[PDB]
Structures are given as structure tokens and as C-alpha cells.
Amino acid sequence: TEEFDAIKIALASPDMIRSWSFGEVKKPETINYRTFKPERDGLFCARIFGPVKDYECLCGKYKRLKHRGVICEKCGVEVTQTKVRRERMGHIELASPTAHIWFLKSLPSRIGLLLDMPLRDIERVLYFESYVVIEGGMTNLERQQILTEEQYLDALEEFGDEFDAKMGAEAIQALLKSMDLEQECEQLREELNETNSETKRKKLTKRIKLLEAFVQSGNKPEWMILTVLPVLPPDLRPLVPLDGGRFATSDLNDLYRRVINRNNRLKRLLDLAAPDIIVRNEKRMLQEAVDALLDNGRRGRAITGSNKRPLKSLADMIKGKQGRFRQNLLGKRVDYSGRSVITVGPYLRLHQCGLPKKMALELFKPFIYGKLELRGLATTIKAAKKMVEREEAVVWDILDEVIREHPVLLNRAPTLHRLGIQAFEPVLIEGKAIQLHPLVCAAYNADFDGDQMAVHVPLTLEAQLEARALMMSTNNILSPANGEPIIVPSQDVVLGLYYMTRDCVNAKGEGMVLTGPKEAERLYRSGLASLHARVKVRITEYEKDANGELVAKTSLKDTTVGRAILWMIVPKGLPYSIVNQALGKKAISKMLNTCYRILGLKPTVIFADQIMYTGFAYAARSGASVGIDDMVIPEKKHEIISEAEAEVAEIQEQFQSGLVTAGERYNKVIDIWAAANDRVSKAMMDNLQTETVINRDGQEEKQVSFNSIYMMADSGARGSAAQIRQLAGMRGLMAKPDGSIIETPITANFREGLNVLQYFISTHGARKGLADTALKTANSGYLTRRLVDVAQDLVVTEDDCGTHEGIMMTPVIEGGDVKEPLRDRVLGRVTAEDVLKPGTADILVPRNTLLHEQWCDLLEENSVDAVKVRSVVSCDTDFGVCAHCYGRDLARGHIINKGEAIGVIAAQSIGEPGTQLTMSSIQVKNKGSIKLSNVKSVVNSSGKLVITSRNTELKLIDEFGRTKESYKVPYGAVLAKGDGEQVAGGETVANWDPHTMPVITEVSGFVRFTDMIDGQTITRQTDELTGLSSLVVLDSAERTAGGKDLRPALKIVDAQGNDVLIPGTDMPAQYFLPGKAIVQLEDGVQISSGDTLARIPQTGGLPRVADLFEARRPKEPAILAEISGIVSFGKETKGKRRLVITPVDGSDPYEEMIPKWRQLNVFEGERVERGDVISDGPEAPHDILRLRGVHAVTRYIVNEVQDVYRLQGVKINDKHIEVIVRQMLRKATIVNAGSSDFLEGEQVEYSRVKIANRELEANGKVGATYSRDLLGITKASLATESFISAASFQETTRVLTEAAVAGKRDELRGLKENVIVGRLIPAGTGYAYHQDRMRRRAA
DNA sequence: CCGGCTCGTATAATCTTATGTGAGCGGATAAC
DNA sequence: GTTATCCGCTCACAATGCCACACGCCTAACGAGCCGG
């Protein structure tokens, strides 16, 4: 029907089924097919469902339209349309009751969770193997106690009429309604208030939440068991018309026939007083038959004749890649469409495409019919059909009137990102292929290798106007993933423009003088002066530094004839120094980009067209071919290979004498072949790039070459140094598929021949790369599918949330070069707070403005290192994202409008380039200030600097204050310098030992042995070839039971032998000793201030991004600190080693367990702040969230995923990854109960908690306390309020079972739901629809 | 002169190169 | 002893899109049919 709100779901009562149906099927036969009338009371019928033909009795009595409503008596068939055959249900009244298969085997077992009874027991009740007891009463036995035949017989001896024990589905049906619901809830609530054990509280909170949701619905525990089973309207499972004889049956019809045969046989056996064994067996057969009908997968049994495939049950018509969500309710086939192969056609403009004439007559047939019947050239529709099937000459003029302003959508099939479908205007072509403008071809990522494209037609008025405004190809220049133009001129235009704008030192007409650029053109056409000969010309140029107008300026510049020709298509704005250089690929790309920045939109489009036209024209007049004498072999290749063979023979002889081992032999050979390959490549590149010597009109000079493939590489059209390296120099080192890299490299190039073995070796890398591509495609597609499932319901919905939180951005520095500066990251995001000038108390930026480009430069000039800026993850708006929390939009210019469905474009921007992926001393480098962060150090006796703080960090600074470089300075290392010591570059400023942990002291004196007994705790090991016998101290577990209860310790004393206190505190720090602690300076030996007491020895591709957005737990994570306090070890081997951290003021209830196998960092007297590392390794983000706050997990995810995308040169803006992070941490647990109705262990979406706390804080009550969860993206999709949006995604079965038990109700808000139903989307245009509806509802 | 043959048709049965997850449940396992 | 945990076994559920093309989708024995021997 129409005008309906939210969809409601619940269980279905038997009386509801009798309210549905229109008759009772009794006979299992479909049709007689002697005559093809349907059999009465079969699966097909006419009295039950409806008329076979239109408006006719099956008897054939009433055949007139004016007899509607009155049924026949010859056939009992209501004279109605055959659409009624699509819509009337049927019912079957079963003999025995029957268990539903989903509620038994969803696995959370709904019956088993409800009755508190294990699943296997209920299974061997339902399949007739046991008994249950139903109100035994004055009986030894209990209720849920189950038996066998022997205990049942012995009970019949004992309590022969007391207990009531049944079996089969009737017994479970008896147990279900015998149970109350209120008493179980109140009893188990009192029991949960009388329980402290955790797992019992888990199970009981599950059971009472099940019961409370089950009572707050409408339904009952009787309804999980079927009694009356409904059947589908028989047009919806149609009988296949074959050719000759019989009709081919579907799967549903065979399953219903089997069920009805079994039901009739059981009903007759009940009619004749059958013995008990046979009716038990028959009820088991009927239960198994209904379990085969509803879902064939739990018992994979029903297979048909001549095709041993599982038949398609009703649940198989919903799941999978062919059920009604993925197949038919999202991707529908569409009329007015078409398909062809494509073809270039370089004469087009940017906003049009080539359309075949005949196919365009075929598409627009109704518009043609309307134009013909308008102009009087026809009267009926059949006259118009005859005229357009004759293809008379008036029809082509009519078709050209139909085209003129009516755009057409074009599409390429594996659509990744939102530039995949675009709208053009048509230009008619007598042909059979679709022409397509060549600049757009990079955006589609189209070949011309046979790639096919498709055509759709917008046909209403709003669709034409949207395809003109929102989607015409003159409106998509910048990319939504990053603000870069997608209209880069490709390979051939690059070659043309690079060949035009060069120079050579002696040509025709060199050094003459010219008037305009057009006289240089007239000299090029006549053949008087060549295309590139240097010449002084006169140029006028316009500069718009005047505030909104143009300033002329005329001068004489030393330039080239080709550059003067190219200047004629540059518009008024740009300065002449944009076309004075050699103009490769990136140069003309930034030419287009600066033309977009300074002038606007329309000169950018028309300038890209003029560039494409003249680039193809002069690429034609070049004649740049390629030939076998354009690949210059070096003259020095032969002796380099000879010297490499001499060196490998010498290393082979040094291995043969036995001096060098095999691994170092391997390493020397691979190093010298790497060096030889690099030398040959250097020689060939130096021989190609500059060999061209030409006569000056003096003697000789040098210049950049005019060789063919060097122009094809130096312009950046096709190829790199690597491909042109393999063509003439030798090719690399081929690696075998085991993972090793082979000894002998391929000594030959491609211009010479390869022999048999070397080609056979190269085949390995070929097939490896091909298989990698073949699997990488599918994995990227699946990950894109899941991300756009997650982020779909999120729309920029209001203007200004108006908060004062956010994040702090600093330009990222690994320690090598600064990877991303502050300009590129925080271009175009709205400032959180007023970042002050380095001139203090001077407002450099207002707190609530937008960092546009000029403003970004004026922020850059004062060398700001950290800017605070508003993110999406802290935006305040319920059910959406505020506008100023998201900033300016990519692919357009200004701030984002209210409605842009940013979650979908974000998921596409992450998931689009997924195909391109794959599947001992600190040394400063420049001069600046030396800053050490979290440093607490002391100079020892030997002048070295040992640090008593773990978290020391190195910052190389300039004179300004911005960070030049950064490194990590370990705890207590060998430091060549101190803090703030102004040093210069190239300096190794630090060192340490990777096999010695610092057990450094704090005072001077002696070190004495407390509980360090040789034979109990410590051992005396003599280094047998040096002479310094030392002591080795283990931990408690590695030594035996003689020192297991003992704790060895190096007690820090003075030279007298007494504990000198730490300067600042009053605590003696005796040093208890961990394992592998080699104590060198023993008792009686004087120590220093912080001296080494004990020496202690110790992915990346696409699945990294997959395992990160799943947020799955890494192996052996890093233990953090829960709250600050003094560390204290405790009891050993109660599973693990205990640890108690005592706060300064609060108590210490948490006594954390640590596997003593894994190592540790902190010491006993040491105390650390919360969230700090204990055992090194990977980290799960759960801990990062619950300890370091909310922004920390966003920064961790952004930096890691952005490292994986910076490794391949892929540039993706950060706000997309932020708005994917927001949809991951939306659920929440509750810590208290609060003052409202929320339970404690209640998982609940955060925004409802936030509006509940806002409503309670409006009054004077107390709120609730919540811990923000963090789920995987598939777990976040699969737990959503809309039960449609979780049904369309994977595991539809479990979602429909849980949603049908709970009886939910889906508001239809979001994108995916309204696509399913088929009204306007609440995202784009139609957003302005929905709130216009919403104010209609509330008022 | 009913079904022996011959046909219309309704309906029952002895794999064996996969991976990675999560999620749950039965059996051991370390304490007052 | 008995109780609250830890761990190994078993099992459901996912794995891009589109295109063309092409050939496939029962029968030994239980209720009727013909009429010969």
C-alpha cells in the first residue's frame, strides 16, 4: 500500500495464519495435464487461490466484465483479475505439531536459552529418542529431567499415573506454555542480586534480557512450534512450461508435495488406531520433512532425480548472492539501456560523447512517438510504429529534435569510485561503437583493449536536470579522495607538448627577432624557422594582482618558437613563466591546477580542450617513432660483466679454501652483483641522456638528447628508469618463488636475446604477479563492500554543533625526512581553538574559521608546529555530522552543503585504490636545538649520561621552534651529548647495547649481596677463555626450588655498607634481580653514579588494512598501566605471576596476572603513569581507547593506515578515515545503573545514552556512567537498530530470528532502507524532502 | 475374459587438497 | 573435598562485479488399456 511508516515484525499466531489464508490444500497433485486445468484442492487450484485466465470461472460460465464479484458454483471461483493469483496465501493443517527449524538451530538456541536446557537434549527429544517430564508432582523425578525407554518403564512401574511424560514436539509444546513469565523474571532478578560469580551473572543476564524482551513484545512461547503451515501464492513459484510433454517442476513444489504426502499418510495412520512405533516413526518423518522445507542446509538431504544438487528451500531464496536482498531489491535491471564496445574519437568536446545513430533511434522511441503525434505526421500509435520501422527520412530530423539538450548516462562495469558513471550530451554517429572523450578515459580507468561500456537514459524532468547539474562531466575536475585534478593530460598529449617546448642550440632562424606569437606561427608554417630554435620575442601578458581586474605588461623574452605557439592558447590570467620550461607531465598538470585556482571553472574546461587539441596536432607533426637503433647498448657492459665474473670466482675460491662460510659467500655475491647492476644502469643512462653533440656554429656543445625512448621516459609519458633499464642494460635479479633471490642475475637485456634458462627463470615472476592480481581483486572488492555497508547511514545533517574539542595536528616525522608537512594535512579543516602566534597573546587565527590556502600560508610563516582542529569523531550532533566539524569538501571548493552523503564517498575513497596494493646508534643529520622529552638523567663517573626515565625522546629543532627531526632515546644508554647542547649534523650522538639492560644505580659506594647465595640463587660462571669469572643471577622460576622462595638482590649501599637514600625521596632502592642478569661489579667492588651492574640480553599489504579495520586482537599484546602507583610483585604460579599496583591515595583492588614467560620492564620501587608499556609488542586498540582516551585510537588508526597508503604513493585525505573510525565506536556499556531505567550490563548505542543524560541533567537527577566500546566493522554493521540494514548484509537468518523474537520495528531512516522500499533517498536532493515531511509529522 | 504385456505416471535411494575467523561448550586445572 | 578458571575441540559463515555464448533439466514398479490367445 501507500503512505506507510515503519515496518513492524513479530511472530505469527495460528489464528493469524487462519486470518491470512484462503483455503486448505489437501491433495498433493499439481495438475492433471490430460487437460491443463488445475486439480481442485491441489497445490494449484482455482477455488482456493484464484482464476486461471482473466475474469473467467474455471467451469467457464461467466466471461463478462459486468459480472464482477459473484462467484460461480460450477467451480467456486470468484471472477477477479489474475493478480489475485499472486497474492492469496494458503494454509495446511498439520496432523502433529512441528518444531520450527530456525528457532531450534539458529545456534544461539532460542528454545534452549528459553528453557535453560542444552540443545542436544532438546534435539533427542524432538527426533523421538527420549522423554521429558511435564509436572511429575508426587514423584521422585523433576521437571526438566530426561529419560530413556528404560527409565520411563521403571518410572511406570514406580509412579505409574503420577508423572506425565511425553515425547516429540507435543512434549516441548507442553513445556513451553506450562512455564510462566513474570515469576521467572522476578526470581532470577532476586538471584542476580544474590550472586557475585561472573559467568553465572553473564548467563542469567542473558536469560532475563531474553525474558524481558519476550514479555515486552506481544508474543508467547507457544508460537515457536508450528501447528498450521502456510504456503506461497502459486504464481510465486511457477511451474516451468517445457516444450513437448510434462512440465518441469520447481524445488518448492517438490518439497510441498513431499510434506503433503507425509501429512496425509500420518493422518490416515491416526485414523486407523495404529501401533505406537509406527506413529512415532511417522511423526519423526514429518518433522524432518518440514525441516527440509524451511531450510535445506541443516540436513543437506533433499536432492532430486538426475541432478544431485540441494533443492532451494525458502531460506535459500533470501540469503546468498541470489536471494531477494542482494539480487533483486538492490540491483534491478533497467529499461532504456544499452551496451557497446568503445572507441576514442579525439574531436569531441569535454561535455559530449559519440552515440550510434541506430541505437539512439532504438532508445528514444516514446519521445519520437510523441513528437510525431504532435506535428500531425501520424494519428495512431500504429502509424508511428510503421513510420519508425520504415526509417523514413523525417524520422532522423525528429530524432535530432529529440536529442538536442537531453543528456545520457554512461557507465563502465567494475565501478569502484563515484566517477564511474557520468553524464554527457550526445552527438550522433553513423557507426556501431561509442566514441568517448580521451581526457575522461583515465577517470573511468578504461583501456581500448576491447573494454565495453553501457548507456542509460534519464527520462523524467528532475532526472534530466540532476544529470545536467550534479553529474555533467564539466563539474568533476577535482577528485573527492584528494584535491587534485582528474583531467591530467595523458600519454600522447604529454609527448606532443614535450616535443613542442624544447630547445636545440643550432637550427633554422636562430637568434632572430619577432613581433607576436602569431608571427612565430607564421614562421613555423612556411618552413623558414624550425620549431625549436631560440629567439627573442615580444609578449604581452595580463596579471590580476589588481583587485578584480587585469593589468597588461609587455616585454621581450628569450624563448622558443614552440613556446610562443603554445602561449596562444593560454588564457589571460597566468604568467609567462608557466610555459617557458620543458613541460613534461607534472608541469602541465600543475599548469591546469594553477589555472583552476586563479581563474575559475569555465577557462579550466576550455583550456584542457585546447591543450588536448594542440597536443595531438603537434604529436602528429612530430613523427616520434621507435626503432631498434634507438636503444643504445653501453660500450662498457662487457668488461663490467667480466670483472664481476672474476670477483665471483675469487669469492668461490675463498669459500673453497674454507676461510669464509656459505652465508657470507652468498652475501658477498649478492652485494657485488647489485653493485655491477647499478654501474651498468648508470653507464647506459649517462650514454642515452646526453650523447647528442651538435655543431654550435663554433665547434661543439652538449645537450639533452632527441632520442626516441628518452623522450618517452623523460616526459613521463610511458615508462620509468626501470623499464628503459631492462630494455638496454641488464635486467635485475630475478627471485625464485620460494622467496630467495637467485645467485646469477640475468646478464642480458631485451635488445639482445635471452637464452632458454633465463627466460624460464623470468616466467616465475610473471605467473606470481598474475596470481597476485587475480586474488587481490576479490579481496579489495569484499573490503569495499563491508566499509560501504558500515558508513551508509551517515549524512551531514546540520550546520554547527558548536563545541570546543578536537585534535592536535603536527607534521609527521619518522626520523628520516618529514613525510607530510603541516600544510598538506590541515589544509581545509575548521580550527578548533584560537591557535596563538609565537608572539604570545596575539590572536594569529580566530578560533572558528576555515584554513583555506592563503590563510594556511599566513599560518605557515610563523612556523607553527601544532594546530588544534575540529574532527568528526568529536562532533556533537545526534544522528549525523555537523558541517563545521567536517570542513570544506573535496572535489568542489567551499564548505560542505547539508546533505552530502559523506560516509559513502569516504568508503569509496578508502576502498578504491585497494587494487594497487600488494599481497644500534642514534645519528643526527642537521644542526639545531637538541630537545629531550621526558628526560631525567645523570652523568656517571666516566662522563657518560644515563637516563632514569624510560620515555626520553629526541627533537632536532631549528632556530624557530618547529621540529626538524625526532628519534627515540632509550632508558639509560650511552649518550655522546646531553640536553640543550647545540651540536651540528652528521653526528652519532648516542649508543647502547641490545644485549644489556641498564640496572644503573642512583648513588655511589658499594653493592652488596642480599639473598644472593652461590648454589641457592646465583651461579659462579667462569668465562673459560678470558679469565674474569662472574656471577649470573636468574629469576625465581628459571632456578630450582632452592631459590624459588628466595629473592636475590643487589642492595645499593655506600662504601661503608649502608643504604644511601635517593636524592629527593627517603626510599632505599635495593635492586632485586631478574633473569639473565650477569652481575660484573660484585661485592667489595666500588660502583659509580648509575653504572652497569647487570648485563641482561633480550604483513604490510592489504590484509594489514583488513585486520586493522576489523580491530582484531594482535598476538601477544602490550600490557599497559591501569592507574598509577607503586609496583609490587606477589604470589607465583597461580596460572600466572601476580602484580599489585598501589595508588597514592586510592586502593589497589586490581591484581593483574602476567605470564612470567613474557618479559617485563618496570621495577619495584619504580612507579609509572597509567597507560604505559610493560611487555613490548603489538597493541590492541581496545586498551588504547579505554586508557588513553578517544582521540588516541583515531590517531593510531590514521597513522598506521596512512603509512600503508604512503608506502605505495597513494594520496588519501584523512577525514575519510576519521569518519570510518566514528562508525566503529558507537556502542557503549554502562558502568553504574544510573537514575534512569538503564540496566548495568546493557549494551546500548551512545546517542540514546547521550540524550538520556541530557534529559536527566535538564532536571536535578544523576546521570549514568558509560564505557565507550569499539567493535569491528562487520560487528558494527551486524548490530544496528534497523533490522533491514542487518538483514541485507551477511547472516540474514540469525538477524531475522533475533529480530522476530524481540519484535522490533524499523523507522525507515537512512539510505539503504529507503532504497529497499523505493522512495526518495534522505541524502541528496531528497533530503530536502524528508525534513519537509518531518515537520509535517510533528506539527 | 483378467491381466500378460504395455503404458501413465508419482516418487523412494550405498566424499576423501582449504583458510580464517568467531563463538560456544566439554574436559582439565589451580585455589580455601 | 569443591569452586571458579583456562584451554582444546567442534562447528556455522564468508570469499568482486558484469557480459556474452553453448548444452542440460530421471524412471523399476504401482494403478489403467487392449484384446491376443
Add this chain to the structure above:
RNA sequence: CUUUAACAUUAAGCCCUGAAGAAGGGCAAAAAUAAACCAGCGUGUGGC
């Protein structure tokens, strides 16, 4: 015994609307439900 005998027909309701004994209904009770005539899905291959 004086010139052919025979007048029959007892059974189906009550109430409302309606110009009526013109007609339209409900309730106490029940056997029995030709024609003149507008006009698919499951395997394989290949491509991107």
C-alpha cells in the same frame, strides 16, 4: 321397491416498512447446494 348415486376444500406461522389482499425484509422450525452485437537455473568456455 317401478326407471343411476355425488357439494366437497379442517395444512404452513409472528413482527417491521409500505396507498392496499402492488411490494420489500427480519425472526420460533428444516430436507438440501444458440445468439443480430464495440473491439527459467546449473555447468563449462572466453573477455574486461
